[PDB]
Amino acid sequence: DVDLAKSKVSAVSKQMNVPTEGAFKKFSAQVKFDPAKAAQGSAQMTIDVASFDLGDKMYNDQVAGKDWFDAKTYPQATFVSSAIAPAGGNKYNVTGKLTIKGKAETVTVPVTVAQNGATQTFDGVLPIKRSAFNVGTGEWKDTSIVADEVQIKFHLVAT
Ligand SMILES: CC(C)=CCC/C(C)=C/CC/C(C)=C/CC/C(C)=C/CC/C(C)=C/CC/C(C)=C/CC/C(C)=C/CC/C(C)=C\COP(=O)(O)OP(=O)(O)O
């Protein structure tokens, strides 16, 4: 499987002179994938949500708090695949369970895969609604302040 230092998971939000992008500095992931048997593959990711870095300590503290991630109550977010559907041209629709702030949803993410030497790379973007996971509640429900749509971007490098 993977390499954190070589890999990146980020989230892009809007409001609306944006992107505002933050990156999770601590996560793990496991991938098992052979394009000759793609549907037999699997992947999981576990993110340490308190490691989310927007490049600003006050923003980082706010987003860790109860109305946002509530990182003390829910320290991790997870994705676990259940199916992989080839989409043609090194693209695969990867379906699985995304759990954020203790709320689970089935999601399908388009992933592009490349191999070069002993390295495999997995790139994709998953749009979600933060409200679906109750991320940014209370006064932060107002989507004229922070948009509901958040794009989760990942670049996973294995071996
Ligand atoms: C074929 C194969 C095997 C492929 C591999 C498959 C594979 C590994 C796929 C991976 C797919 C996925 C889903 C990967 C990600 C996995 C996980 C667990 C993702 C969860 C990440 C996560 C916690 C996402 C939630 C992100 C959210 C909703 C973040 C909130 C966004 C945020 C913090 C916005 C804050 C806005 C900011 C910084 C400031 C606002 O400032 P403000 O005060 O309002 O300014 P003003 O007042 O001026 O307006």
Question: Given in angstroms, what resolution was this structure solved at?
Answer: 1.4
| CA-proximal residue: ligand 1, atom 31 (nearest) | 13
- CA dist 46 and 93 (Å) reads 19
Residue position matching structure tokens 């992931």? 29
Contacts with 142 (C-beta within 8 Å, 6 or more apart), sequence order: none
CB pairs under 8 A, 24+ apart, for 74-79?
A: 74/49, 74/100, 74/101, 74/102, 75/48, 75/49, 75/50, 76/46, 76/47, 76/48, 76/49, 77/46, 77/47, 77/49, 77/101, 78/44, 78/45, 78/46, 78/47, 79/43, 79/44, 79/45, 79/107
- CA dist 78 and 13 (Å) reads 19
Find the 12 Cα to ligand 1 centroid distance in Å: 6
Nearest to 63 by CA among 71, 55, 76: 71
27 lines ligand 1 (CB under 6 A): no
**Ligand 1 atom nearest to 156, measured from its CA:** 8
CB 32 within 8 A of CB 2: no
- CA dist 153 and 1 (Å) reads 19
Contacts with 35 (C-beta within 8 Å, 6 or more apart), sequence order: 90, 113, 115
**Ligand 1 atom nearest to 84, measured from its CA:** 1
Q: How was this structure determined?
A: X-ray
From 61, 129, 135, give the residue whose CB has the most ligand 1 atoms within 8 Å, as the site to mutate: 135
Find the 95 Cα to ligand 1 centroid distance in Å: 18
Find the 59 Cα to ligand 1 centroid distance in Å: 14
